[PDB]
């Protein structure tokens, strides 16, 4: 009976989307009581102008995370100046893979300190990580002082798994929140991810999921009868 | 075959690639005589530090093109300083779709002017455009003064087709060059794309293609 809407970060990140489409996307989400909307930097100002109660989240160095630190910082800074309340920042996976852990932590710390007012979520790209790397990823995000660790950008051949979220939840030990995203297109999946540890859910199907929840809540029993 | 290596922009853009792999990629491409390597901003310094004859290309605002103009500018400038000789810039498709053509042209013009020493290629993302939008795309790239109009980006449900290349070439009518990319995995395809009008080939399988070219040459003669 989980109110999934409050966990949803509805994403409208497709490049072919018009500004009008972004506007109505933000409106529908607000109407459905969805917690937040995730958009690309170009759409931050627009989203914040339309949004009333819905939080405005902006993707930084998305989706590849291979922009220079200075560029990620500028993008993070400008995102907040355009009205961003939350930042889903893609870390530098190549540096991580090259074992430049300090560089990864410092890039995140620098981006965070230049944007103290926003909630910081670090996308670590779990579909490219094995168990050990995920444990390291968690320690990196915690050392960086992130509020959340986001599993995936969606730009991968595999969606996030329940195993991945369960592991992150266990490794975290309550010192960081978890955002499950990537391949989540329905209510049952969103619910399972939350039950597995997710504190927030990333999806581009937030409207459909929110409606399916509404339908079930209106029709099926579960209250006090 | 008409030496396809001179047309190849070998791309190494997956984020899971370590810096050791990027180095090996650039080295291998160099040994095979590939025209250029295409990398993300972070890898430009590394790529240029090992590249001898291969040209260094950097993707800007890649692959979504929805970054602010200001950041795309900074990214482009930083790329040049790191050693980039060519820049493959993703235009703002949202703005395009919203009919903000002037915005789109102006963003590109601005990026180009801050990096006058680099070859400028505009990725228009053809898999998200119909025939009419492709023709408008061509007129935008020409108006912006780009050297090449690039088809895909690689992150799309479909690659480029011979029909798209033929279309772009005829619409261009010698006013801009064409770089075909997206789904080009082998020599046969690379050759057909060039025959269709491609002046450059964007591919992540450049090593395989160049090797196939050498093998055919050495085995046939």
Write the CATH number for A91. Answer: 3.20.20.70
CA angle A70, A71, A75 (to 5 degrees): 120
Q: What is the dihedral of CA A189, A194, A199, A203, to 10 degrees?
A: 10
**Helices H, strands E: what count in chain A?**
9, 8
Cα–Cα distance, A201 to A216 (Å, whole number): 19
Query: For residue A157, which of A194, A182, A187, A132 has the smallest C-alpha distance?
Result: A182
- Residue A38: strand pairing partners: A11, A57
Q: Which domain holds residue A204?
A: 1-225
The verdict on whether A179 is a catalytic residue reads yes
Beta strands per DSSP E along B99-192: 119-123, 148-150, 177-181
Min Cα distance A1 → chain B (Å) is 36
Q: How far is CA A112 from CA A42, A87, B70, in A?
A: 20, 9, 20
Query: Mutate which of B48, B62, B66 to test chain A, going by most A C-beta atoms within 10 A?
Result: B66
Q: How far is CA B109 from CA A215, B2, B60, B147, in A?
A: 50, 34, 14, 12
Cα–Cα distance, B143 to B135 (Å, whole number): 12
Cα–Cα distance, A26 to A66 (Å, whole number): 28
CA angle A114, A118, A119 (to 5 degrees): 125
Cα–Cα distance, B195 to B208 (Å, whole number): 20
CA angle A13, A147, A33 (to 5 degrees): 55
Identify whether the C-beta of residue B83 lies closer than 8 Å to the C-beta of residue B64.
no
Method: X-ray
Question: Which residues on A lie below 8 Å from B13 (Cβ)?
Answer: 64, 66
B107 touches chain A (CB under 8 A): no
Q: How far is CA B10 from CA A21, A209, B60, B66, B181, in A?
A: 35, 41, 16, 24, 10
Do residue B40 and residue A66 have CB atoms under 8 angstroms apart?
A: yes
Question: Which residues on A lie below 8 Å from B74 (Cβ)?
Answer: 70-71, 74
Burial of B188-207, coded b for 16+ CB within 10 Å and e otherwise, reads: ebbbebbebbbbbbbbbbbb
Query: For residue A155, which of A15, A26, A43 has the smallest C-alpha distance?
Result: A15
Cα–Cα distance, B16 to B14 (Å, whole number): 6
Burial bucket for residue A63 (CB in 10 Å: 0-12, 13-18, 19+): buried
Q: Catalytic pick from B72, B121, B150, B177?
A: B150
Burial of B155-179, coded b for 16+ CB within 10 Å and e otherwise, reads: bbeebbbeebbebbbebbeeebbbb
Q: Report the 10 Å Cβ neighbour count for A223.
A: 6
Identify whether the C-beta of residue A199 lies closer than 8 Å to the C-beta of residue A179.
yes
Q: C-alpha A198: how far from its chain's center?
A: 11
Beta strands per DSSP E along chain B: 8-12, 36-39, 55-60, 86-90, 119-123, 148-150, 177-181, 200-203
Q: How far apart are the first and last CA of chain A?
A: 14
Cα–Cα distance, B171 to B135 (Å, whole number): 6
Q: How far is CA A191 from CA A116, A185, A186, B203, in A?
A: 31, 11, 9, 40
The verdict on whether B88 is a catalytic residue reads yes
Cα–Cα distance, A55 to A185 (Å, whole number): 21
A to B CB pairs, distance under 8 Å: 108
Question: Which residues on A lie below 8 Å from B97 (Cβ)?
Answer: 16-18
Q: 3-state DSSP call for residue B182?
A: coil
Task: Indicate the number of domains in chain A.
Answer: 1
């Amino acid at each position: 009976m989980i109110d999934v809407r409050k966990y949803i970060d509805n994403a409208a990140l497709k490049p072919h989307l018009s500004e009008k489409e972004i506007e109505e996307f933000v409106l529908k989400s607000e109407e459905l009581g969805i917690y937040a909307v995730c958009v690309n930097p170009y759409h931050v100002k627009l989203a914040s102008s339309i949004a009333k109660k819905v939080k405005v989240c902006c993707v930084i160095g998305f989706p590849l995370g291979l922009n220079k630190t200075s560029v990620k910082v500028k993008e993070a800074v400008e995102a907040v100046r355009d009205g961003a309340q939350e930042l889903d920042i893609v870390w530098n996976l190549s540096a991580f893979k090259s074992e430049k852990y300090d560089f990864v932590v410092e890039e995140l710390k620098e981006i965070f300190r230049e944007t103290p007012s926003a909630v910081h979520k670090v996308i670590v790209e779990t579909p490219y990580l094995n168990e050990e790397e995920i444990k390291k990823a968690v320690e990196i995000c915690i050392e960086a002082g992130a509020d959340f660790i986001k599993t995936s950008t969606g730009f991968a051949p595999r969606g996030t798994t329940l195993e991945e979220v369960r592991l992150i939840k266990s490794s975290a030990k309550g010192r960081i929140k978890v955002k499950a995203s990537g391949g989540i297109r329905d209510l049952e999946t969103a619910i399972s991810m939350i039950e597995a540890g997710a504190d927030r859910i990333g999806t581009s199907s937030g409207i459909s999921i929110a409606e399916e929840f509404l339908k079930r809540h209106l029709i099926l029993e579960h209250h006090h009868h």
